[PDB]
Amino acid sequence: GRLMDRIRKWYYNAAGFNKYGLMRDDTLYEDDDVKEALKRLPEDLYNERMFRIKRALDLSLKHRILPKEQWVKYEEDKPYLEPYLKEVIRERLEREAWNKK
Amino acid sequence: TYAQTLQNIPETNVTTLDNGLRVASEESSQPTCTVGVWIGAGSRYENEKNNGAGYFVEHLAFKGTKKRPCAAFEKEVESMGAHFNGYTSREQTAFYIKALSKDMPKVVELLADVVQNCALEESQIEKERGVILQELKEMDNDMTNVTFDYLHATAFQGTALARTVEGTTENIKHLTRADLASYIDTHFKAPRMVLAAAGGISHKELVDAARQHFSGVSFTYKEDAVPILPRCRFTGSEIRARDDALPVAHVALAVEGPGWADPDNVVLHVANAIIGRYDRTFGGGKHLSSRLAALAVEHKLCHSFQTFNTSYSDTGLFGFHFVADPLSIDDMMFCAQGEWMRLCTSTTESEVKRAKNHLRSAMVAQLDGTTPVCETIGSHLLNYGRRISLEEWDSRISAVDARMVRDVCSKYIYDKCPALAAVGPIEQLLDYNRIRSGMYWI
Amino acid sequence: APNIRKSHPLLKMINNSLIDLPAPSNISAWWNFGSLLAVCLMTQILTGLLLAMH
Amino acid sequence: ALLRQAYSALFRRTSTFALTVVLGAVLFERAFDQGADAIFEHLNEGKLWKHIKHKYEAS
Amino acid sequence: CPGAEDLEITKLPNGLIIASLENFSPASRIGVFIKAGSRYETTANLGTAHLLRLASPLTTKGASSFRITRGIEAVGGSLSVYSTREKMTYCVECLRDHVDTVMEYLLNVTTAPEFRPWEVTDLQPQLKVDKAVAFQSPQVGVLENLHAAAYKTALANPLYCPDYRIGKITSEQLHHFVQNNFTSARMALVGIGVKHSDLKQVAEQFLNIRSGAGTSSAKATYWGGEIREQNGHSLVHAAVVTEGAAVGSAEANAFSVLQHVLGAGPLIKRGSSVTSKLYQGVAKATTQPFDASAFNVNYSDSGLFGFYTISQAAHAGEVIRAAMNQLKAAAQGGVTEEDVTKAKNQLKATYLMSVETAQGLLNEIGSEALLSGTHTAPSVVAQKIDSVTSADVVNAAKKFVSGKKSMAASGDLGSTPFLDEL
Amino acid sequence: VHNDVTVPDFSAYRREDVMDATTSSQTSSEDRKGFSYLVTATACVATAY
Numbered sequence A: 001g002r003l004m005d006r007i008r009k010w011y012y013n014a015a016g017f018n019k020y021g022l023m024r025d026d027t028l029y030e031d032d033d034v035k036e037a038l039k040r041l042p043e044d045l046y047n048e049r050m051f052r053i054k055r056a057l058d059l060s061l062k063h064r065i066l067p068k069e070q071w072v073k074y075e076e077d078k079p080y081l082e083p084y085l086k087e088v089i090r091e092r093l094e095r096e097a098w099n100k101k
Numbered sequence B: 001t002y003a004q005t006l007q008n009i010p011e012t013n014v015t016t017l018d019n020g021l022r023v024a025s026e027e028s029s030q031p032t033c034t035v036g037v038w039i040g041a042g043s044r045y046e047n048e049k050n051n052g053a054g055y056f057v058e059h060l061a062f063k064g065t066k067k068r069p070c071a072a073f074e075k076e077v078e079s080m081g082a083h084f085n086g087y088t089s090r091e092q093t094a095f096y097i098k099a100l101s102k103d104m105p106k107v108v109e110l111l112a113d114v115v116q117n118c119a120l121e122e123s124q125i126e127k128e129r130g131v132i133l134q135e136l137k138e139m140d141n142d143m144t145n146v147t148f149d150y151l152h153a154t155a156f157q158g159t160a161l162a163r164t165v166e167g168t169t170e171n172i173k174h175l176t177r178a179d180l181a182s183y184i185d186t187h188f189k190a191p192r193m194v195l196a197a198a199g200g201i202s203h204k205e206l207v208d209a210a211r212q213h214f215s216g217v218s219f220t221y222k223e224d225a226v227p228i229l230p231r232c233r234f235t236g237s238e239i240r241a242r243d244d245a246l247p248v249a250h251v252a253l254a255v256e257g258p259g260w261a262d263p264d265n266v267v268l269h270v271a272n273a274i275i276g277r278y279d280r281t282f283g284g285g286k287h288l289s290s291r292l293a294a295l296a297v298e299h300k301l302c303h304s305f306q307t308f309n310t311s312y313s314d315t316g317l318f319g320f321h322f323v324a325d326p327l328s329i330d331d332m333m334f335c336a337q338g339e340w341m342r343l344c345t346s347t348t349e350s351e352v353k354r355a356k357n358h359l360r361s362a363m364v365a366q367l368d369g370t371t372p373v374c375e376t377i378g379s380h381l382l383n384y385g386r387r388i389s390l391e392e393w394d395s396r397i398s399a400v401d402a403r404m405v406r407d408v409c410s411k412y413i414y415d416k417c418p419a420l421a422a423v424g425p426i427e428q429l430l431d432y433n434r435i436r437s438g439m440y441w442i
Numbered sequence C: 001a002p003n004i005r006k007s008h009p010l011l012k013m014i015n016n017s018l019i020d021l022p023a024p025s026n027i028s029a030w031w032n033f034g035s036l037l038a039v040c041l042m043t044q045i046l047t048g049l050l051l052a053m054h
Numbered sequence D: 001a002l003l004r005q006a007y008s009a010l011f012r013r014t015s016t017f018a019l020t021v022v023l024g025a026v027l028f029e030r031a032f033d034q035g036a037d038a039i040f041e042h043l044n045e046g047k048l049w050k051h052i053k054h055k056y057e058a059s
Numbered sequence E: 001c002p003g004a005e006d007l008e009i010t011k012l013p014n015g016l017i018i019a020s021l022e023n024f025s026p027a028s029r030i031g032v033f034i035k036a037g038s039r040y041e042t043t044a045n046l047g048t049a050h051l052l053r054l055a056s057p058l059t060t061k062g063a064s065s066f067r068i069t070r071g072i073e074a075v076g077g078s079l080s081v082y083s084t085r086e087k088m089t090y091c092v093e094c095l096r097d098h099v100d101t102v103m104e105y106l107l108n109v110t111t112a113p114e115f116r117p118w119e120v121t122d123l124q125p126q127l128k129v130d131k132a133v134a135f136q137s138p139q140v141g142v143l144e145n146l147h148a149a150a151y152k153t154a155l156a157n158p159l160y161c162p163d164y165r166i167g168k169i170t171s172e173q174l175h176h177f178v179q180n181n182f183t184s185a186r187m188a189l190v191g192i193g194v195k196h197s198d199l200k201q202v203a204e205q206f207l208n209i210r211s212g213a214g215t216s217s218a219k220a221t222y223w224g225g226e227i228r229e230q231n232g233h234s235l236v237h238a239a240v241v242t243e244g245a246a247v248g249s250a251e252a253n254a255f256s257v258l259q260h261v262l263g264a265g266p267l268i269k270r271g272s273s274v275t276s277k278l279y280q281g282v283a284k285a286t287t288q289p290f291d292a293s294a295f296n297v298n299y300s301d302s303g304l305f306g307f308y309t310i311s312q313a314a315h316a317g318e319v320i321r322a323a324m325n326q327l328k329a330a331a332q333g334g335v336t337e338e339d340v341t342k343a344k345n346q347l348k349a350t351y352l353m354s355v356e357t358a359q360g361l362l363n364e365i366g367s368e369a370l371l372s373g374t375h376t377a378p379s380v381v382a383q384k385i386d387s388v389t390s391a392d393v394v395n396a397a398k399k400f401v402s403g404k405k406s407m408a409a410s411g412d413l414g415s416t417p418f419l420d421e422l
Numbered sequence F: 001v002h003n004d005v006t007v008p009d010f011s012a013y014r015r016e017d018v019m020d021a022t023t024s025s026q027t028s029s030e031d032r033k034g035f036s037y038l039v040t041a042t043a044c045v046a047t048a049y
C-alpha cells in the first residue's frame, strides 16, 4: 500500500526546504558529481535554480520564509538535476571500474 | 586470422654478389613497385672538414650522370612515370625509385648509374651551393629539428654523432668537386650497399640486373672490409638556446640507447608505446589512455609531445620531446619525467598488453606500400644483418610483460644523467640539477 | 595543479619560499647569515625553553 | 670494484640508501665513540678516576 | 595456405552497399563512406558538417565518449574521419582479430550519436584550433576562397566552419544533418582485410538510420569571380581555373591527361620537371624560386581545372602570365603525340601507386561502390585513360582558354594581376 | 644557423674516465655516482650521529 508515499510526503514536509521555495535538488550538497551535473543544466533551468537559491539566502539572512501559499508542494517539486547527476555517476563508475581493469 | 596472415607473407630473398653488394627483395602481386640502394653512409662517417658531403652529394645524385647529363636523365625518369627520391641521415643514405614492376630492370641500371657515375658537373655544384645554403636557413626555422640536432650536439658532444647531417656553413661554402668525388669513392661501395626491392618483381630477374650493372669486382681484401666506426661517447649535459621572442618553447630530453642489435630495443618500444604521443588535435582528448596525454589535456601542458627511440649501430637516444607555451614548460617536464619514473617502478600488465597491440599495429603500419617495405628491407639488412619478419617481431613483442618493461627501463632510465636540449622562451624550465633529480623515485 | 607542492596551501608555502624560490646565481657567502640568523633563533628558543624548565 | 658494487647495492635504490645510512650510523657511532674515548683517556694516563681507582677499591 | 580472393560487392533492399576484399594482410581497415559535406550546408547551418567531423568521439547511444577511445585504444586500433565538400568517411584500422571490437564504435559513431549539448558545447571551441593548424598552409587558404569565387552554392561552401559560426552550431543542427544525410542509400560499408560474409552480416543486422536520399544537394551553379587576399606574405599563391569536368563525365579522362601534360607534382627530389610544360615554360619566364602545377577537381555535378602558382610577390605577374600562355599554346595543337603518350603513363603509374596504401586501396574500392555501385577493373580504367585522343586533350585546353575563369590569390598581391588582365 | 653551433670543450672539467671522446661513459658511470653518493651517504651517517 501507500506507506512509502505517506512517509516520503511526510519527511518532505518535515524537512521544510519548500518553506524557502527550494526544490529538493536545490538543497544537494555540491560534491564533485553534483558539480559536473549542474554544468550540464540548460541555461534556463540553471538560472531558475540560481535565483531560487539566492532567494532562499536572502530569506535566511532576514530570518523569514515564504508565505504558506508559495511553499513548494511535495508533488510539484521538479527533480531537475537527478537525471543528470545519475549519468555523471554512471560515467564515473564506468571510468572508475575500467581503470582498475 | 592474424596468427596466419603473418606466415603467408612472402619471405625475403637475400643473395650476396661476389663483389660485396647484397641483393634482397619481397615479391608481391603488386603491378607497381619500388627499388633502391640503401647505403651505410652518413654524417657520422664524415670528418670535421668534409661535414656535409653526403648531403651535398644527395643533392647532385639527380642532376645527372656521366652516361647521361641532367636534361636526359630527368627526362628519361619522368617520361616512364617513375618517382626517384632518396635521403641521407647520420648513419644511413638511400636512393630508391618508385616505378611499374615492368621497368624494374631499366631502373636498377639507373640506380647503379647514380651511385657509381654521378657527373658532379663543376657548374651544377655552384648552384647546389646556394640551394643547400637556403635549406639551412629554412630548416633553421623548424624548432623540432633545431632541437634534435642540438640534442645530439650535446648528447654525443665531442664525437661524430654530435654532427648535423647538413653540415657546417663553411663546409657548404667550400666543399670541392674533390671531396664530393672522394666521399662517393670512399663510401658508395658494394660491401656497404644493399639493393632492396619490393613489389611485383622476381628476385631472379632482379639479382641478374645487379650482376649486369653492379660489376666492379674487388681485388684486395681491404675492399671487402666493412670499416668499424670509432665509438661515440654519451654525455649527460644540456644546451639551452634562449629566445623569448619565439612563440612556443621546445624541450627534448634523453638517455643513451643500446643500438640496433640489442633485443631490449623491443621492450624499449613497448615502453614508449605506453607513454605514446599527443598533439592538440587528438580527438580522444581527456580520455586518451596515455597518462601523459591525459594530464597534458587536463592541464593544457603542451601543444604536442612524443616519445622516441632513435637507434644507431653502436648507440642511441631514448627520450621525449614536447612543444609548450612558455608558462607550462615546468609542469609538463615534471609530469613527463614522472611518467618515465612510473615506467621503471609501477608499469601494469594492463598498460603493456595495450602498448603491445599499439606496437603491433605500429610495425605493420611501416609496411604499407612498396616504398615502406623496401625501406624496411634496405635498413634491416644494413642494420640487423638480415631481415626480421613481422612474424618474428610479434614473438619478441608477446614476450614482453610488465615486469620486463620495468627492469629494462630501470636499466636505461633510472638515475642516469640525461642530455637536454631547450630552445625558445625556456626561462620556466630550469636547472639541470633539478631535472637530474627527476631521474629517481616514482 | 599537477604536483601537490604548488597547490597545497602549506607545501606551496614551504616550496614557494625555500625550494622553487628564485635566487640570484651569484649571491655570495655574505648571504648565508639570513639563514644562520633564522637557525640561530630557533636554537636559542629551544635551549632557552629547556633552561626555563629549571 | 667497490664503488660500483656499493652504487648498485646500496646507493641506487633510495630505500636501501636510507637503510645503509641507518645501519651505517649505528656502526659508525659504536666505533667513533670507542676510538675517541680511547684517544682522550690515553691522552690523560693516570689522571682519570678510572685509573687511580684501584688504590681505594677493595672491601 | 591463403591465396587470391575476389572483390565482392552486395547491395541490400534499402540500397546500402557493401564492398569487401580479403587480401590476407595482418590488419583490417574498415570504413563507412557517405555522401555528405559542406555542399549540403545552408547559410543557416554552415560549418555544421565540419563540427560533425570532430564530433566523432562524443558519446553514442551504445558507447560512451570514454569507452569509444579507451576501447579502440585497448586493441592498438585507430579511428578517423576524412571528408571532401561532398563525401565523408569514417574508417578504423586494427589487427585482424580485433575487427568486430573496433566495429562496435564505428557502427555507433555513424548511426547512433547522441550529440549531448554539453559534450557538444565543450567541443565547439575546438573548431577554432583544428582550423588554425590547417590554415597554416596557405595552400589551403586560396582553395577555400577559390571554391567561393568559382561558385554561388553547394561547392562554394567552405570546408572549414566559418569563424562567426564557431560556437553557434546546435545539437539539433547536428542530428538533423545526420538524420537527413547519413541514410542507407547514401552510405557504403567498404572494407579491406575482411571476409565479405561478415562485413555483410554486420551491415544488415546492425545499421539503423534508414532508407532515403534525405536532403538533396542544390545544383552547383558557376559564379566565376575572383577573391583576393592582401596579407603581406613574401609568397603569392594563385589559382586561376574554369569549369572542369564532372565525376564520371568521359570528358574527365581528358583533363586528367591535359593535367599530366602541363605537369602536376615533381617526380625527382629537388629536380626540374622537363616533362612538365607548365613548369618548364614558367621557368623561362621567371628568375627566382617558385612552383606551378595543373589543378584538377572532379565533383558529382561539376569540376574545376586550371593551374596554381607559388611565386615571389614581385615575380607574380610574370609567373601567372607565363603560366597562361603556356596553357593557350597547348590549347592550340601545342601537344605532341608523345606528350600524350608520356602523360598517359604517368597517370596510369600515379593511379597504380596510389593503391599500395591500405588507405589508398580502401578509398578506391569505396568511392566506386558509392558513386556507382560497381568496381571498374584496373585494366578497364587503363583502356579508358589511353583511349584519349591528341585532340581531346588540346580541346580540354581550349575549354579553359574559352570559359569564364575565376581566380583566387593570397599573398602580397601588390604585383599580382587581376583575372581581367589575363 | 644552428648548424654552426658546437658544444665547447669540457676537458678542463671532465672526470678522468669520461675524458676520452671514444669510450663509453656508461662503464665508469656506476663508479662516478657510487662515489659521490658515498660521500652523501657518509654525510648522512655523520649527521645521524
Ligand code: HEM
Pocket: C041, C044, C045, C046, C047, C048, C049, C050, C051, C052, C053
Ligand atoms: C632571542 C633569543 C634569545 C636570546 C638573545 C637569549 C639570550 C639570553 C641571555 C643573554 C641570557 C643570559 C645568559 C648567561 O650569560 O647566563 C639568557 C638567559 C636565559 N634565557 Fe635566554 N635568550 C633567548 C631566548 C630564550 C627563550 C625563548 C627562553 C625560554 C622561553 C630563554 C630562557 C632563558 C633562561 C631560563 C635564562 C636563564 C639561565 C641563564 O642565565 O643561562 N631564553 N638568555
